[PDB]
Design a protein around this motif. Structure first.
Motif, PDB file in Angstrom:
ATOM      1  N   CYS C  44       0.801  -1.072  -0.067  1.00  0.00           N
ATOM      2  CA  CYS C  44       0.008   0.009   0.065  1.00  0.00           C
ATOM      3  C   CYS C  44       0.853   1.151  -0.004  1.00  0.00           C
ATOM      4  O   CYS C  44       1.825   1.382   0.702  1.00  0.00           O
ATOM      5  CB  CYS C  44      -1.041  -0.050   1.111  1.00  0.00           C
ATOM      6  SG  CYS C  44      -1.790   1.426   1.488  1.00  0.00           S
ATOM      7  N   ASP C  46       0.223   4.244   1.155  1.00  0.00           N
ATOM      8  CA  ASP C  46       0.213   4.951   2.600  1.00  0.00           C
ATOM      9  C   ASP C  46       0.477   4.358   3.768  1.00  0.00           C
ATOM     10  O   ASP C  46       1.640   5.051   4.290  1.00  0.00           O
ATOM     11  CB  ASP C  46      -1.624   5.236   2.544  1.00  0.00           C
ATOM     12  CG  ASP C  46      -1.987   6.071   1.403  1.00  0.00           C
ATOM     13  OD1 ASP C  46      -1.204   6.477   0.307  1.00  0.00           O
ATOM     14  OD2 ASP C  46      -3.448   6.026   1.318  1.00  0.00           O
ATOM     15  N   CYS C  47       0.079   3.199   3.911  1.00  0.00           N
ATOM     16  CA  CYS C  47       0.523   2.382   5.356  1.00  0.00           C
ATOM     17  C   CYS C  47       1.754   1.468   5.053  1.00  0.00           C
ATOM     18  O   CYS C  47       2.627   1.220   5.968  1.00  0.00           O
ATOM     19  CB  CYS C  47      -0.482   1.713   5.913  1.00  0.00           C
ATOM     20  SG  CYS C  47      -1.206   0.315   4.859  1.00  0.00           S
ATOM     21  N   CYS C  81      -4.642   0.064   0.287  1.00  0.00           N
ATOM     22  CA  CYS C  81      -5.589  -0.875   0.846  1.00  0.00           C
ATOM     23  C   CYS C  81      -6.955  -0.484   1.325  1.00  0.00           C
ATOM     24  O   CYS C  81      -7.266   0.933   1.030  1.00  0.00           O
ATOM     25  CB  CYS C  81      -4.710  -1.375   2.163  1.00  0.00           C
ATOM     26  SG  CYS C  81      -4.825  -0.092   3.403  1.00  0.00           S
ATOM     27  N   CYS C  84      -6.955   2.248   4.280  1.00  0.00           N
ATOM     28  CA  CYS C  84      -6.492   3.618   3.629  1.00  0.00           C
ATOM     29  C   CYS C  84      -7.425   4.451   2.692  1.00  0.00           C
ATOM     30  O   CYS C  84      -7.578   5.645   2.629  1.00  0.00           O
ATOM     31  CB  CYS C  84      -5.096   3.480   3.027  1.00  0.00           C
ATOM     32  SG  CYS C  84      -3.770   3.309   4.229  1.00  0.00           S
TER      33      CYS C  84
HETATM   34 ZN   LIG Z   1      -2.957   1.277   3.369  1.00  0.00          ZN
END
Ligand SMILES: [Zn+2]
Ligand SMILES: [Zn+2]
Lengths: 88, 50, 118
Positions: C44, C46-47, C81, C84
Motif C-alpha cells: 500500500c 500509504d501504510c 488498501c 487507507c
Molecule cells: Zn494502507
RNA sequence: GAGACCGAUAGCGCACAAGUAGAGUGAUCGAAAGAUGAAAAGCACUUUGAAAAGAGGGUUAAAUAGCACGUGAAAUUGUUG
RNA sequence: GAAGCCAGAGGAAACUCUGGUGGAGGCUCGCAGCGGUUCUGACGUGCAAAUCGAUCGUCAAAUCUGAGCAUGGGGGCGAAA
RNA sequence: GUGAGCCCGGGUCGAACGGCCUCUAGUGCAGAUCUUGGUGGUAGUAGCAAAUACUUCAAUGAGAACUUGAAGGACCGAAGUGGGGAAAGGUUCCAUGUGAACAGCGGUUGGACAUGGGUUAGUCGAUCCUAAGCCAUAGGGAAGUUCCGUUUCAAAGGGGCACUCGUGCCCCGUGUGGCGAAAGGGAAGCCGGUUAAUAUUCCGGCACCUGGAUGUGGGUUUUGCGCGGCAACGCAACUGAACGCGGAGACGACGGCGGGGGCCCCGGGCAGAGUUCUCUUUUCUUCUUAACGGUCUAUCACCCUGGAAACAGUUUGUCUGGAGAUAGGGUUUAAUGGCCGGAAGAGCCCGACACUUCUGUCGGGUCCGGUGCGCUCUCGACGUCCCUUGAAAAUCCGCGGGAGGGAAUAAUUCUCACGCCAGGUCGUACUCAUAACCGCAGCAGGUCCCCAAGGUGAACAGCCUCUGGUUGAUAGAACAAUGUAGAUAAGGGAAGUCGGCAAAAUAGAUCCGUAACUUCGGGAAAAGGAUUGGCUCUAAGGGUUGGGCACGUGCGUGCGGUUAACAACCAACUUAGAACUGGUACGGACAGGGGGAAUCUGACUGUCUAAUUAAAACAUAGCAUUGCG
RNA sequence: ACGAGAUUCCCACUGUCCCUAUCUACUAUCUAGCGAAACCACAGCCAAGGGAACGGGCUUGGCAAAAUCAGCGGGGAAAGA
RNA sequence: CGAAAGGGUCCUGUAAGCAGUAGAGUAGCCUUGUUGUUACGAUCUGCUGAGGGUAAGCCCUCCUUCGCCUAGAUUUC
RNA sequence: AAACUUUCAACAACGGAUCUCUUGGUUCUGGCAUCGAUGAAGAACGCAGCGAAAUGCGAUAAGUAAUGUGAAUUGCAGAAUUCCGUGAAUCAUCGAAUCUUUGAACGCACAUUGCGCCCGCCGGUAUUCCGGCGGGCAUGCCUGUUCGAGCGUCAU
C-alpha cells in the motif's frame, strides 16, 4: 614470501592487445597503449630510442602503396594506354 | 578459458593452423636450406602472449 | 546411489542469481534445478502493508496476467488498501465540509465588517 | 659508381625464414647460426641385426668429401709401441 | 551466562532473597581458514632465490577473501617498520 | 742464425702464393676475478631416501617393476587422491600410428612425436542496465604534446493542430552523449535417449517468452463501457490519451523457533545377489517421477458480529487488546504440500527365447508405511546491535484523471480462450592442478567457488568404511659406524646446563570443592579430591483419538457433566537408581589444560619490519590544547 | 583483567644427568640404470735452521715400496668472507 | 648336505566347540509354582598346563621320510 | 711382471682454430625529388594442387588486364605448344583494374565481429512480418546557397 609463493598469484592482465599496433601493450584500465600511444592521433616515438624508432619505421612493414610511387614518378605519373593496345 | 572473445579465438585458430612440421617435399627443392620449422610452437614451451 | 550434484551453468559462486533446488528426475538421478528469485507482494502506498488479493511476482511477470488478477475492484485497488481508501474518503468529505463552514464564517465576518464600515 | 676498408668472435645487432627466435606485465631488451661434390653421381644388390646401423659390394679423381659433410690446429680422450 | 521476562518468599512501598527463562559480549576452549611463537628441529650447490615437520597465536570480528575501480617516483601508500 | 726467426725433407691437402726495394697499419700476448667458444681433474663421485605398497598369471613386444586384462593386497575417506566451474592456458580433448629426442631408472606407455577428427542454443552466458569510476561535447587554460570541464555563462527539441488575410499557430520543460559487472540487476526449457570425442545446444516428446498481424468462439452494450459479496474481496473477459501518484526491481549482520524439499535412519513386501562347519525368516541391491499446467489446501495479515477486571489471549523467548481483545464465522499473500494432466509409453530391476553378424523379440514387476534437539538448502514469524542503519539504473505493473472512442445499416479500441507469423551475431572441446595456471621445469610452494555418505564422538576433530578415484612418485640386496625420524629403560630424581632446552607428567565427561586480589564484571577449568568397562534390570520424562438425553432431521438447538483422574492406538531419545560380573588397564586406540607463589612491563581486542628482530614499538577508547562563522 | 613480552622460585614429572644400553623405519653401504657441482699456479709425510717473528719447494737430518675401500674432521682447501 | 617331520628345551597362559539343578535378573506357557517350566543372559565351571609358537645365530635323530652328489668355469714357479 | 700414473710416437676420437672463399657490411663520390581523407606509414587476418616461414598478393588473393620477349616451370603431381603462334614462363615492363578487417580513421562504439539511423533494389504468402544486397551518416574551417533569430540600426 615475496618470491616464489607470491608469484602464484599472477593471473590477471595489465595489458591486452592493441588494435593499432598489435602488441600486448594496451593498458586494460587506462585504455592507452604503452607502445604506440593509442588512442592518441600521433604514434608514440622518442629520439632517446633509435632502436624503437627503427623497429616501427617506414619500410619495416609492407609498403602496400608507397612501394609503387617511385615507378610512377619515373614514368612521370602518366595516364592512358599504349597505342593500339587491345581493350575497350 | 571457455569464455573467449572472437578476436582471441581467431588468433588461436591462426596459431593452430601454423602449428605443423614443414612438408617433406621442401627439403628436396633445389638449393633448399630449410631443414625444419624454426618457429614451431608448443603449448607447454612458449606462450602466445595474448 | 550418487547423491552429490553440480551447477548446471557456468557461474560457480553462490550469488543471489544462482539459486538452485534439488530434484529427483524420472531417470532416478539427483540433479539441481536453477530457480528464480521469489516474487514480492505489492504494498500500500500509504501504510506500506501487503495488499491482499494481489500475487507476488517478479516485475515483468505482471505483464503476462490479466487485469482482474492484478487489482482489486475498488477505487485505488491494487495500489492502496481498503482501510487507507476509507480514511481518504472520510478525510476528503470532512475537509470539504469544513471548507464550506469556513467560507460561510468568512462571509459572515465580511458582512459584519461591511455593516460596521457603512 | 667506387675504395692501399672488413673477410663469418671481423665487418651493421643481422652474409642464413634477423629486428627473427627468445626474455620481460610493460617501456624495452635481443642472439646463435655461411662452405659435400664439377655433377647427387646422396650408395644398386647381398648379408647380419627389432631398429639405429654394421660388413661386403658400389659412386667419385678423391668418401683420407657420406646431407655429423672443404681444410681439420690445440686443450682433452682411446688403442698400439 | 549481560539486559529483558515468569513464579515463589518477604518488605508500607522502593526494593531484597530464591528458582527458572533468556542469549549479550571488538568474552572464552577449539575444527577449517588466516597468521607465524618456539626447536642446539629437517633442509643449506634445497622440493623451494624463504620450502618441510612438530609446536604455537587468532577463529563471529579492527575476521578472511575474489573481481571491478582509484592513488605513480620531486610521487603514492603507510595502526610509522 | 747469439736471438726474435729463416730454410729444407716426409705425411696430409686442394687453388692460390712468395723473394727483393719502397709505401702503409685495426701489426707481435701468459696474465687484466680479461671477452667468446671449447675441454679436463673432481667422478662413474655427491646423489636419484617427504606424500604407508606392492604381488601373481596371461597377452603384446627385440626388450616389460613403472603397458593392458584378470586375480589379490592397500590408500584417499565426502574441508577427498571424488564430481563440476571462475581466472590463466589454448587443442593439452578423441581415434590411429611412432625411429630418435623428452618423461633425472626403464618404456611396447605418454599431456611427447605424426596424420586426421571433434565445440550445433529465441530459453545457458555475452550482448542490455547502471555502480565505484572513465572519456567526448560547450567553454576556459596551456609555447605545445595536451589540462580542466560532464551541466556549464550552449540558440544542445519534442509533441499537436490547421479550407482562408491559406504559406501559419498552439502546448510542454528535463535536461543532454558514450563506455564501465561472463559473481550485482535481468523475458523465456524440462525430461528421456544419443557420440570415439558436444550437448538445458543434437534427436524424440512435452513446454515457455518476446514482438507483430488478423480471424473464430466467448464477453459487453437498446439502463452504452460486466456482475456478485455487509465486508475483507471474488469471478474467463469486463474502454481509458495527456499529465500525475504509488508499488515492484531494491538490498546489513547475528540468535533461537516453526513449515517444506533433498539426504541420512527404521519396518513390511516382490525380484535378484552374497553367506551358510554352526548360526542367521538372514546381509546387500532396484522399487524413480522433470519443466509446464489444473485443482484442493497451507504462518502473517485483513473483514464481520459483539463489547472484555474475578483482566484475558499468548511465545522457547512478554508481547497484544475499548485505537475493540478472547470467542465464533469469513477473506486473502505465500508450495520445494496432496491429487490429477505430463506419465509409463519413460527410466530401472528380474526372467524366457533368438542370435555368424545384421540384429533383437516377448513376459513379470516397479508397492505400502514410520521416525527426528539429525545434515543441507529454502521459506515464514519473531528478536538483538549500531555516534555503523546496510546501491543505482534499465525494466514491469497498479491507481488518480477522463481526453478520445464507442450499439441495434448492429457495434466493439474486450489485459478471456483458441488459432496465424518471426526470433540474427559471438562463446560452448579439455585442464583447473604433487603434470594442462604462475614460480626458467611434468618444481613437496602459490592460486577464487559449488555438491559432501556410514560408524565412534559434543563435533565437516582423530581413526575405520561405501560411491567414485588411485595404486603415480628409480629399483634389487644387505642391516657397520655416524646420522634423520619414532620409542623404552633398574635405582636416584635437575646432582645436568648460562638457563628444566628437550622430554615426561596433566588432559574427555559426572560429582564434591575452590584463596588472595578485584575496575565487583572477574580471578575460576583457580587450588585440592571422588569416580568412569561389560551385563541384567528398575524408575522418570511423550503424541493422537473418543462423552449423555429431548425433538427437528449427518448436522441444529434446548439442556445436562467435569473422576476422560478413563480406555484404545502410536512413538523416540535422554536422565537417575540397583544387582551381578572380568580386571595389570575401563575418556583401555584416538582425541585431550601441568599446576602454583611472585616481580618487571604494555590497560585490554587489534597492527608492522614479505626473506634474521612480533616487542615496553604502532594503533585504540579516554583526556588536554590550538585554529576556523 | 588480558599477554607466543623479560625474570626468580615451589610441587608434580621425567634418560637433563650418574651412565649408558637396546629396538624400529629411512639413509649411509653393495649392485643395475642414470649422473652433476663447488674448487683447482704446481703439488701434497715430518723435525730443526732459513735476521725483515712466514714456509710446501731451500739447507741438514728422520726416513721412504704398487693399486685400493669405509670412515673421520688435526692441517691444506671450504663463509654469495 | 638340504627340505620336512618326530622327540626335547624354552615362551605364553587354558584353543575352537559342546555341555552344566553355576549365573544378577527379565519375559512367556501352563501344574500357578513346589530347582514350576521354557527362552535370553556379561560371566563361571569341565573337557583343557590346554591351544598356539619354537631358530630364523636352540638341541638330538645311520636305525622318521623325500631329495642332492665324484660338477661347471677361470688361473697357476 | 701386470695394472695404475706420467712422458714420447703413430693412428683413431673430441672440438672447430688455421688457410682459401664471399649474392654481405663499412666508407666515399655522383644523380634524383616522389607519402596521405582519391584513405598513408604501421597492424591484423587470409590467398598456392601439394607451404609452416621468407617472398609475392587481396575473396579478380604466389595474382587479373595491357605492352614486350619468344618456349618454359620443375621438389612431386598434372597439364602443355597446332612450334610457323591473340603464345609457355615463380619472365620482364607496367600507363588499366582488383585491393578483406583496420589504422590520422570518419554513424555511435570496440576488452563486443555490439547497437543504430537515412534512401533505394531484390526475394520469401505480404499495405504491416522476415531476410539479403547497394549507396550514405565524424570534426574544425573557407566560399557560396537556402531556412531563420534579435526594437541591434532604420524606412513605411
Ligand atoms: Zn494502507
Ligand atoms: Zn599500440
Amino acid at each position: 614470501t615475496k618470491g616464489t609463493s607470491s608469484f602464484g598469484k599472477r593471473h590477471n592482465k595489465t595489458h591486452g592487445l592493441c588494435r593499432r599496433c598489435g602488441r600486448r601493450s594496451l593498458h586494460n584500465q587506462k585504455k592507452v597503449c604503452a607502445s604506440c600511444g593509442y588512442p592518441a592521433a600521433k604514434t608514440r616515438k622518442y629520439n632517446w630510442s633509435e632502436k624503437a624508432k627503427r623497429r616501427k619505421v617506414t619500410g619495416t612493414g609492407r609498403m602496400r602503396y608507397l612501394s609503387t610511387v617511385p615507378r610512377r614518378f619515373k614514368n612521370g605519373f602518366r595516364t592512358g594506354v599504349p597505342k593500339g593496345a587491345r581493350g575497350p | 578459458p571457455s569464455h573467449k572473445t572472437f578476436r582471441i579465438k581467431q588468433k588461436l585458430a591462426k596459431a593452430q593452423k601454423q602449428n605443423r612440421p614443414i612438408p617433406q617435399w621442401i627439403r628436396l627443392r633445389t638449393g633448399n636450406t630449410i631443414r625444419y620449422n624454426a618457429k614451431r610452437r608448443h603449448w607447454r614451451k612458449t606462450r602466445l602472449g595474448l | 546411489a550418487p547423491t552429490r550434484v553440480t551447477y548446471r551453468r557456468r557461474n560457480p559462486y553462490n550469488t543471489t542469481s544462482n539459486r538452485t533446488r534439488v530434484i529427483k528426475t524420472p531417470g532416478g538421478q539427483l540433479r539441481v534445478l536453477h530457480i528464480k528469485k521469489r516474487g514480492t507482494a505489492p504494498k500500500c502506498g500509504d501504510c506500506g502493508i501487503k495488499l491482499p488479493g494481489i500475487p507476488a511476482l517478479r516485475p515483468r511477470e505482471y505483464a503476462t496476467i490479466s487485469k482482474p488478477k492484478k487489482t482489486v475492484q475498488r477505487a485505488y485497488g491494487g495500489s492502496r488498501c481498503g482501510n487507507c481508501v476509507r480514511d481518504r474518503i472520510i478525510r476528503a468529505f470532512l475537509i470539504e465540509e469544513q471548507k464550506i463552514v469556513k467560507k460561510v464564517l468568512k462571509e459572515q465576518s465580511q458582512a459584519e465588517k461591511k455593516a460596521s464600515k457603512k
